[PDB]
Amino acid sequence: FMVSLPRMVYPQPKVLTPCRKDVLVVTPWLAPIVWEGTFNIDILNEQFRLQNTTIGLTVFAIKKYVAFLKLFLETAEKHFMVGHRVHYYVFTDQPAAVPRVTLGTGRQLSVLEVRAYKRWQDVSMRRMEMISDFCERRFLSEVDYLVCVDVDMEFRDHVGVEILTPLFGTLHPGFYGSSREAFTYERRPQSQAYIPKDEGDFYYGGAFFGGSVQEVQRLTRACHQAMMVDQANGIEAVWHDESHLNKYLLRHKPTKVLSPEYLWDQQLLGWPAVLRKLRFTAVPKNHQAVRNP
Amino acid sequence: FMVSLPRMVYPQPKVLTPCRKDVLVVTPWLAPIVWEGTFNIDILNEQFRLQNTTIGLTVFAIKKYVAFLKLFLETAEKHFMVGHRVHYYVFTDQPAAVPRVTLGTGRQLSVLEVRAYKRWQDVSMRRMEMISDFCERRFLSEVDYLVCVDVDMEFRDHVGVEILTPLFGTLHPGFYGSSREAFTYERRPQSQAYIPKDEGDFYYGGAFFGGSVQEVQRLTRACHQAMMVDQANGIEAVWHDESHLNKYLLRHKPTKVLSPEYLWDQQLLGWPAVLRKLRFTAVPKNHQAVRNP
Numbered sequence: 092f093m094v095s096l097p098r099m100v101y102p103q104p105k106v107l108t109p110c111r112k113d114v115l116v117v118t119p120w121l122a123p124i125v126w127e128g129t130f131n132i133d134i135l136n137e138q139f140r141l142q143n144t145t146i147g148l149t150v151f152a153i154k155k156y157v158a159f160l161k162l163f164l165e166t167a168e169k170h171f172m173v174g175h176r177v178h179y180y181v182f183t184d185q186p187a188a189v190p191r192v193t194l195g196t197g198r199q200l201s202v203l204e205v206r207a208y209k210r211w212q213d214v215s216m217r218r219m220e221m222i223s224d225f226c227e228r229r230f231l232s233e234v235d236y237l238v239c240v241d242v243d244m245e246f247r248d249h250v251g252v253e254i255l256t257p258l259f260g261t262l263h264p265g266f267y268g269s270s271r272e273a274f275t276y277e278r279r280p281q282s283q284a285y286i287p288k289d290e291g292d293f294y295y296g297g298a299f300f301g302g303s304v305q306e307v308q309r310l311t312r313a314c315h316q317a318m319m320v321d322q323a324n325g326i327e328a329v330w331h332d333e334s335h336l337n338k339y340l341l342r343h344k345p346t347k348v349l350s351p352e353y354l355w356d357q358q359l360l361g362w363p364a365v366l367r368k369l370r371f372t373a374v375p376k377n378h379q380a381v382r383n384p
Numbered sequence: 385f386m387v388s389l390p391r392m393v394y395p396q397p398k399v400l401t402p403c404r405k406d407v408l409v410v411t412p413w414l415a416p417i418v419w420e421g422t423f424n425i426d427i428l429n430e431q432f433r434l435q436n437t438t439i440g441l442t443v444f445a446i447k448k449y450v451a452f453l454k455l456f457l458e459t460a461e462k463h464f465m466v467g468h469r470v471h472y473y474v475f476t477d478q479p480a481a482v483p484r485v486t487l488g489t490g491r492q493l494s495v496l497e498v499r500a501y502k503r504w505q506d507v508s509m510r511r512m513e514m515i516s517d518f519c520e521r522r523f524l525s526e527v528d529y530l531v532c533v534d535v536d537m538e539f540r541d542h543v544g545v546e547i548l549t550p551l552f553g554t555l556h557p558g559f560y561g562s563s564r565e566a567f568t569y570e571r572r573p574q575s576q577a578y579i580p581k582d583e584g585d586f587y588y589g590g591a592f593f594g595g596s597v598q599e600v601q602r603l604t605r606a607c608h609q610a611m612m613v614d615q616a617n618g619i620e621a622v623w624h625d626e627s628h629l630n631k632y633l634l635r636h637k638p639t640k641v642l643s644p645e646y647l648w649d650q651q652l653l654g655w656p657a658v659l660r661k662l663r664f665t666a667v668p669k670n671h672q673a674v675r676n677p
């Protein structure tokens with residue numbers, strides 16, 4: 092049950108004025124595509140705070156990637172769901188290396204110790220299994236929504252309740268303007284992640300997805316089960332968990348899609364005019380070195 | 385639980401092309417505004433048919449308004465939710481005057497006998513009470529969604545599952561381009577329907593609203609209870625049930641808003657360029673005569 096919003100003064104929506112003239116703001120299945128200019132955050136904050144919404148944020152920091160936690164968490168404190176209840180879940184093989192970051196009121200952090208796989212591909216892929224497992228261990232009783240992100244990132248601007256919905260994916264910053272033929276889906280029919288050249292809505296990034304706990308558990312269980320089928324068949328999808336996420340979200344359409352404001356790499360892509368805000372961005376990195384002993 | 389969509393071939397969404405350049409397609413609280421060009425009905429039909437969705441349609445035909453049922457129901461058979469399960473609920477004081485309209489497979493009609501109030505205003509307003517009552521009598525066990533419409537209308541084009549959502553209102557065709565000061569909300573603070581001049585998102589039409597059974601029961605109960613408070617205080621809202629609906633949807637934002645394609649009067653308003661389709665339209669009528677003995 093939802094109580095009534097209080098009286099609020101804000102600009103009237105303009106029925107005969109598009110909120111964006113340069114981008115698609117709704118998918119063909121009527122899911123909003125979240126860009127700056129599409130939402131009034133004051134209305135949304137009221138709606139979600141009147142439900143005392145709690146957001147869980149999962150992040151994996153395994154092996155050398157513990158080095159990214161301090162900036163990740165500091166900047167999440169500035170920009171992620173401020174004003175709402177937040178529960179960070181840091182999955183790591185090195186509990187003692189988690190930095191002591193000062194948290195605002197109503198925000199808490201749990202360290203979840205997990206094993207480290209040797210190959211970065213397996214570390215990345217086994218997040219699905221690990222998130223799925225903890226949906227029973229903790230998440231269903233502790234949070235309303237889960238947001239599942241890469242750690243080698245920082246928040247630069249607001250990431251708030253405008254993202255929350257039963258199931259969301261994020262447009263990958265390398266492909267948002269691309270034709271579906273150019274998307275790097277898995278193209279081998281032998282893999283469970285296979286998507287034909289004439290199928291696909293978007294290329295979603297594996298580095299930022301989420302939803303209600305129930306929908307995230309479904310997604311993560313399905314992707315883990317598909318990756319186990321592939322393993323038994325001797326195939327590993329071209330882009331690992333991201334390939335399986337794309338297969339899942341083709342077949343199970345998300346109820347919101349986040350624009351690349353929410354998943355960006357300024358070193359590789361700059362700051363195009365179509366991005367009014369750069370919210371969550373890659374940290375400069377030496378891929379080989381940091382993924383390797 | 386939602387099964388996977390089958391493989392489908394359709395045009396790729398265009399991230400860098402607005403689906404409409406002339407209208408707002410999402411509200412500031414991220415609810416789609418449903419216009420032609422915003423949705424791929426093939427995707428939506430798959431999603432809703434994989435849930436074996438049943439839609440209830442309520443219509444009141446009391447006193448002389450029984451004359452409107454034949455065209456209403458015939459045209460609903462052509463255009464309303466075709467391919468899905470439909471349950472029509474005809475509320476009337478004259479069961480014997482309900483025309484025998486031939487229904488397609490999977491579609492059924494129930495006649496619900498109710499009393500006739502003398503004043504058209506009370507007939508119109510007491511729909512809230514009557515819909516609310518039947519949410520327990522029948523609707524919760526029989527349908528997934530309810531769509532609640534005026535009878536003095538006809539379907540001219542597709543009205544389908546693109547409208548379905550937890551709670552929807554429809555832009556009134558006389559006000560979709562108007563400033564909120566010009567909206568004919570109730571403006572007397574003594575009424576429960578009161579909305580100040582600096583508040584309001586849209587002017588919704590009382591002639592077409594709906595949602596899940598749970599959300600429609602909430603809306604109708606709240607509006608009936610507010611109309612009973614007003615009656616005890618000797619005030620009747622300026623536009624009756626429509627005034628109370630607007631108060632409710634200001635305080636409880638709808639999860640979709642239908643464009644005026646879905647509620648139109650061609651005699652009074654013509655066929656503007658902004659309407660690509662005229663879906664559900666007024667029948668020519670003599671208001672005084674037909675609302676009177």
Ligand SMILES: O=c1ccn([C@@H]2O[C@H](COP(=O)(O)O)[C@@H](O)[C@H]2O)c(=O)[nH]1
Nearest residue numbers: 151152153154156211214215241242243
């Ligand atoms: O050695 C590794 C490799 C990957 N990851 C986790 O998996 C995510 C995806 O890997 P990458 O593409 O960012 O390297 C990382 O952001 C990080 O959360 C680790 O923690 N340690």
Ligand SMILES: O=c1ccn([C@@H]2O[C@H](COP(=O)(O)O)[C@@H](O)[C@H]2O)c(=O)[nH]1
Nearest residue numbers: 444445446447449504507508534535536
């Ligand atoms: O005598 C009346 C007056 C109103 N209505 C119902 O209430 C709706 C709203 O009234 P009106 O504004 O269309 O006249 C009508 O479409 C019809 O469904 C009746 O059935 N009989």
Ligand SMILES: [Mn+2]
Nearest residue numbers: 241242243298
């Ligand atoms: Mn990364």
Ligand SMILES: [Mn+2]
Nearest residue numbers: 534535536591
């Ligand atoms: Mn009418």
